Amino acid sequence: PTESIVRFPNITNLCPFGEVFNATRFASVYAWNRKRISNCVADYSVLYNSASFSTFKCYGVSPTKLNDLCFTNVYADSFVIRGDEVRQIAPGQTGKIADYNYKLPDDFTGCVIAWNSNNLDSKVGGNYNYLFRLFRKSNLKPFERDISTEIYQAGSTPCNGVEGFNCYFPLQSYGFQPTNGVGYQPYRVVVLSFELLHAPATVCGPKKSTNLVKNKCVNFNFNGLTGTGVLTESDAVRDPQTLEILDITPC
């Protein structure tokens, strides 16, 4: 334990968090957008301390720890819902939004951010531009999107493609006015999902990396996992920068 070394990839590009969060137009909950952000350094501290979010809930990660973890991929899903329906954006819950619109798996690792949007999505009269699915034969499997507009039949009589008795159009609109309550006001939601694979890490935090040493007992922190021992050029770690392979030996 004479020295401590940390090794991270030398990526310097900043992640496009602003494009996701500062977006001009969002998407309907039934047809939600997915963006993959990679090959960048991600600083979630400023995002967490922005203090403009009504909801910031992280599942499976710690709010402060995730600043120095390396993820293979990061996905961001953005949409707009009602104020009361933000409760349904969480693993292991039920409702019209968690059954037919957007389902999160029970073993979810990521964060959920939600903030009020009454000053952007509400107009005198009504918005009537954000839809959501009301009827469906089966529940949505986790991370599945359905965008069909087929006529839902509730009875034995066939619909024949035209709505009528026991034949409904599933997609119904949200009506937003600036005079509604808090539970009837638009909320913008961004869900960040962190994916780890056997591939080398690509998205990492802003942690400086120092020089490496060999043949001495030191403390090492490679791509997020730590250890103590002697690093010998050849229980085995592959450092990111110099593409070498090091063996760990007890000291």
Place this chain on the structure above:
Amino acid sequence: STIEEQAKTFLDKFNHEAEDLFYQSSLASWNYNTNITEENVQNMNNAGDKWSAFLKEQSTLAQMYPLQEIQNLTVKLQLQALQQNGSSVLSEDKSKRLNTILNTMSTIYSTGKVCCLLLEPGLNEIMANSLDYNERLWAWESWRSEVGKQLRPLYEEYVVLKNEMARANHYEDYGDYWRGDYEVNGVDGYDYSRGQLIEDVEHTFEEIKPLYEHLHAYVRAKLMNAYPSYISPIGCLPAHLLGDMWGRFWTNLYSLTVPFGQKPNIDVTDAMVDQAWDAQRIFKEAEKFFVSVGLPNMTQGFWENSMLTDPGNVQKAVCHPTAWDLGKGDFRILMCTKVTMDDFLTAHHEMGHIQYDMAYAAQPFLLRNGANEGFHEAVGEIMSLSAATPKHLKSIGLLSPDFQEDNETEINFLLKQALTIVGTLPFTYMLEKWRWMVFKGEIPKDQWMKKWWEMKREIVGVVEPVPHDETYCDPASLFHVSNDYSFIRYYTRTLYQFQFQEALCQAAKHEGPLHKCDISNSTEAGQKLFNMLRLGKSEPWTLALENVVGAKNMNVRPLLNYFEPLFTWLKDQNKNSFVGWSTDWSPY
């Protein structure tokens, strides 16, 4: 698949489609009421037409689901609410005739002149402060001889048309249609019947006759001093000396009938003026009073969207105290507030309405209403009842903290309360009994006024000053009778008010007289109330009543326990005076 599942799908679609339409109609209505222009009336008419057409079409659609298949008992309630035919069962010509009759009766009642003097306020001021026999008799007789004579032919056809409409909807008569509100079925142990409301009202009234008889004897003895030879010591009270056009309220008789006139009442208007209250501290204080019991605060938009002061000279509005629930989580209050005690109490009344409207907002669209007719106003009234006590005034800061409370003040207060509460139950009971009898056909068309006056003499203890022939229609002179409004909701409300007050005071551990009870700073009472408020129309009214008072029916014992000091004092006072009335004596 099954009928219940299709009904559930249809109800989901209907709720989603109906909430927005109701919200838009309410917005148009609020816009007209706050700002009176010629543009807003068209917006109201169009929004109302859209909402009515949507409701009619959805009712016709919902009629296709048989009601025997559903066993959920919560889907069944909403389907029953939608499936109601209403007056559409009548033919087109008959429907047009009925609507024309109703519009003509309302218009003729509204436009009535005595030559000229209008009822508001020319006749009301005379009937309130004349203190002269001849003038009061002339004012009382002229309005009847004009309106009742001009309204008699229309009511006769109104009755038969409404009876046909009600018998078309599988009821016995239109009175049965009115009684259908107090009906529970399909629930074991909480059942109720339309014919059971004929009972349980007579039973409650036979327990009020002693107190009302003593009050009537006291009022007659005190009123005999003003008019020397126009009142008999064994007869009934003439109908034109009761401080009102109809005698519904005896409040105006307070000036003559004061127990101890030297001792004043509690009027905190001067304290409010000197402390510079400005129509915003009143509602903040009401919100504090409601929070201290455990109920939530007012929403953020309640403060910025609502109107709490007159618009001004440039903008005109019809500002009566009203609480608006526009839907989609939007609650407001429309009221012109000035610095008095009456507005201080009306603020608590209206916020009681508002807090009742907030509780059941999680219910479906069709179940967002009070359990029955009397629940909403009783809940509103108990808050104003509790907020007027001297203890509550002293805790707030207005009224001196060393006030002297004695027997005279409480007797004055109790008499002033009973001149309004007790003095109106016999009138309501008699009027609703007469209307039910007319609808049922028991009273023939040629014996209307005779039976009306005989019932008034036997029950209310009031006689007419001049005889009236069959060409008169005295009952139609009342606003509710000509404008087709139910009138038994002013009886159950009065009973439920005192039942709730006694239950809450038993929850708040108050010791002493019931009329000095206060409910503030107690959270158990708040929880006991909120357990019933959140139910809405989902549960039977018997079950909702049980959650506060512990009974499945209304009782009159709390009402008599409230007025015990007054009853004892009146019994002491009437030792010499005669108690009871004789129907033979007449002014002529």
